Amino acid sequence: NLNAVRETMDVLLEISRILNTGLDMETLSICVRLCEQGINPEALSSVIKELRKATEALK
Amino acid sequence: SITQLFDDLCEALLPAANRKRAKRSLKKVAYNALFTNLFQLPARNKILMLSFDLRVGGLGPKADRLEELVEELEAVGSVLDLLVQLAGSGPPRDYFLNNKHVGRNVPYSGYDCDDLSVFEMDVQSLISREECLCHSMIQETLQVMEAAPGTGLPTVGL
Amino acid sequence: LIGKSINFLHQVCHDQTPTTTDLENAFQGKIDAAYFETSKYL
Amino acid sequence: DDDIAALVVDNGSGMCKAGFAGDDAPRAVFPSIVGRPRKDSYVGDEAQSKRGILTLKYPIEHGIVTNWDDMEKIWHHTFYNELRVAPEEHPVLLTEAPLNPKANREKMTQIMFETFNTPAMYVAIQAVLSLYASGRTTGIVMDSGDGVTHTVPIYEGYALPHAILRLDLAGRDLTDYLMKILTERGYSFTTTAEREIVRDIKEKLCYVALDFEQEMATAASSSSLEKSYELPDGQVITIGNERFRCPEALFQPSFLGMESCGIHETTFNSIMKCDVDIRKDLYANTVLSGGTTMYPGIADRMQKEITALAPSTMKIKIIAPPERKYSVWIGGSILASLSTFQQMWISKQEYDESGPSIVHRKCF
């Protein structure tokens, strides 16, 4: 399975790039590990945008 | 814990250059927005609905590739469900379309003048982009060469 | 007097342990409270 | 700061955890033993070390407060040794085991305003608070810690109390059953200190079997659970077969001799008494919690029994935390940060104006 979940991790990258999401490789790994727990992703979509707003609040 | 992965989300999205008090406030920001939705159709169908607007805006092979990958990923369900909700707020020759000089028994359609004209626009967008860089490099520095002295440097504050 | 207690704990006990208008008179508020914690902790 | 910092004191059954909100780890951890002569005002390690002229006494021993004078004493030593802070500049969130009674809550705010003198306060249910740390606010929570156990169903942001199932299981019962089996199998042992050490061994080193049958056959062919332990003092404790019967008592509860339901039976009856229309919505995030994660192998038996429990028409979606030992403390710390949680936070003014009983109404 360890063969399969590296290749599915690589194909998972392209559809996150072409859908124009804010994710790069690192944040993609954080988010795939976070969804693996069982969290609803429609909730995660708001906390990522609130972090990216309040990050710009400092600078 | 799961609440610890939210600290690592704050770690990736804010690099370090203070920088020990901002991260706890951003951790509060990460916690405070998660539970407001929790108090208050398939997955690949929305992918087709987004490939449609691509095809409306031209750019055929990109839609043909987006449909190509979900077809083999069904041949991880919850992570593409995040990407359709994060869409459109992040950062974003060939001689076999209008060059009939290469191929083997090339298709006969007479000639072209109606996509060969949008083969110059394919370069015209690049020519219009690489001049906007030099408009935005002369501007950032004429904002320094012309000012009353020391209003862009904090050296007057020393 | 309070710097003769913390240093004393640090030197001969060999413990490096945790011990836990005008200029508006900051000193009086903190000195007394710090004593009331520190000297009792020793 | 820009507003006064919230404080959290978590009065747990095995240990007391105090600290300031703004941190994920507690500021101080003491044992909950209160020394009373057979010092005379000190709650913690020094009372425990001076337990030869001091008799044993615990303020919280069941998992809830069963001695109020003793709790006021540990609350007073919390205020002076663990904090020594200005109390009127620190609103405090207390946390007790699931479902605080009203009269217990009235006694709680009654002494919280005199021994501590709090400016504003909060009193909270435990399993909901622990769920809020696991990243959801709906689900069914089996909270089994060092005190009392509950399988709490919670949906709509506050628990459904008609199906909340209180189950008598604690660390008290665990240490007593360890004494029972360790003296029953045949060994010279009655002392308290090795009882604590062998209890730590059962908490960390002992294996929680995934099933009864497979581990029975593995140990019956040749005992593969066998492991030796070598202390600084030179303790020698070994056999796999005693380690296999020690946590076996929750698979079938009549193995010990107690009468209350096992883990699968309690969680099945708890999810059965909660409504069918929200059952599948509740089952899409079922959680594991409690102090028993000191060895991460009880989670395996839990998720196997939960996938055996529900029908195959909706599959298991269980969230297994990669940490849940500090679950109650992090529950408090994540909860008190929110701005909307301040609207359930009751002041001293209402507590004086409409009696103590409004702390049951506004905070619930």
UniProtKB/Swiss-Prot annotation, chain A:
A GO cellular component entry from the record: interphase microtubule organizing center
Source organism, top-level taxon: Eukaryota
Chief location of this protein within or outside the cell: cytoplasm
Annotated keywords: Acetylation, Cytoplasm, Cytoskeleton
Keyword ATP-binding set for record: no
Location of this chain's protein in the cell: Cytoplasm, Cytoskeleton, Microtubule organizing center, Centrosome; Cytoplasm, Cytoskeleton, Spindle
Biological process terms in GO annotation: gamma-tubulin complex localization; microtubule nucleation by interphase microtubule organizing center; mitotic spindle assembly
Subunit details: Associates with the gamma-tubulin ring complex (gTuRC) consisting of TUBGCP2, TUBGCP3, TUBGCP4, TUBGCP5 and TUBGCP6 and gamma-tubulin TUBG1 or TUBG2; within the complex, interacts with TUBGCP3 and TUBGCP6 to form a luminal bridge with actin that stabilizes the initial structure during complex assembly. Interacts with TUBG1.
Family of this protein: Belongs to the MOZART1 family.
Function recorded in the entry: Required for the recruitment and the assembly of the gamma-tubulin ring complex (gTuRC) at the centrosome. The gTuRC regulates the minus-end nucleation of alpha-beta tubulin heterodimers that grow into microtubule protafilaments, a critical step in centrosome duplication and spindle formation.
UniProt-recorded name of the protein: Mitotic-spindle organizing protein 1
Organism: Homo sapiens
Lineage: Eukaryota, Metazoa, Chordata, Craniata, Vertebrata
Gene label: MZT1
Portion of the full sequence shown: 17 to 75 of 82
From Swiss-Prot, chain B:
Compartments where found: Cytoplasm, Cytoskeleton, Microtubule organizing center, Centrosome
Disulphide connectivity of cysteines: none
Domain of life: Eukaryota
Subunit and interaction comment: Component of the gamma-tubulin ring complex (gTuRC) consisting of TUBGCP2, TUBGCP3, TUBGCP4, TUBGCP5 and TUBGCP6 and gamma-tubulin TUBG1 or TUBG2. TUBGCP2, TUBGCP3, TUBGCP4, TUBGCP5 and TUBGCP6 assemble in a 5:5:2:1:1 stoichiometry; each is associated with a gamma-tubulin, thereby arranging 14 gamma-tubulins in a helical manner. Gamma-tubulin at the first position is blocked by TUBGCP3 at the last position, allowing 13 protafilaments to grow into a microtubule.
Protein's job: Component of the gamma-tubulin ring complex (gTuRC) which mediates microtubule nucleation. The gTuRC regulates the minus-end nucleation of alpha-beta tubulin heterodimers that grow into microtubule protafilaments, a critical step in centrosome duplication and spindle formation.
Family assignment from sequence similarity: Belongs to the TUBGCP family.
Illness association: Microcephaly and chorioretinopathy, autosomal recessive, 1: A syndrome characterized by microcephaly, cognitive impairment, underdeveloped retina and choroid, and epilepsy in some patients. The more anterior parts of the retina, near the periphery and pars plana, have a grayish hue and diminutive vasculature similar to retinopathy of prematurity. Visual impairment becomes evident during the first year of life.
Name of this protein: Gamma-tubulin complex component 6
UniProt gene name: TUBGCP6
Portion held of the full protein: 3 to 195 of 1819
Curated annotation (Swiss-Prot), chain C:
Entry comment describing in which tissues the protein is expressed: Ubiquitously expressed.
Annotated localization: Cytoplasm, Cytoskeleton, Microtubule organizing center, Centrosome
SS bond list: none
Regions that span the bilayer: none
Domain of life: Eukaryota
Annotated family: Belongs to the TUBGCP family.
Descriptive protein name: Gamma-tubulin complex component 3
Organism: Homo sapiens
Residues of the full protein shown: 485 to 545 of 907
